[PDB]
Copies of this chain bind each other. A is one copy, B any other.
Amino acid sequence: QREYYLREQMKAIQKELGGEDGLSDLEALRKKIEEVGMPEAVKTKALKELDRLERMQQGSPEATVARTYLDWLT
């Protein structure tokens, strides 16, 4: 629930600063991962790739590679 309100205020500041929301920033990882498969080790490594994408929104040569990674995994 603390996670809930904190990622909700994080989406609040996301809509507060951005005008468009800049290609789906970090949101869906609650439910698009919970339905494909999966082995629990894959789910834990997924969250340890999901729960750290609070890094940057724009660009990038670093976060788009990880987004293609999590797409290819999901």
- Tally of this chain's copies: 2
Q: Classify chain A: how many residues form its interface, as a range.
A: under 10
The proximity string for A residues 5-31 relative to B, scoring 1 for CB distances below 8 Å and 0 otherwise, is: 000000000000001100000000000
User: Which chain B residue has the least Cβ–Cβ distance from A49?
Assistant: B20
A residues 48-65 with Cβ under 8 Å of B? 48, 51-54, 58, 62
Q: Enumerate chain B residues within 8 angstroms of A52, measured Cβ to Cβ.
A: 19-20
Residues on A lying within 8 angstroms of B by beta carbon are 19-20, 48, 51-54, 58, 62
Task: Rank and list the top 8 A-B pairs by shortest CB-CB distance, nearest first.
Answer: A19-B51, A20-B52, A20-B51, A19-B52, A19-B53, A19-B54, A20-B48, A58-B62
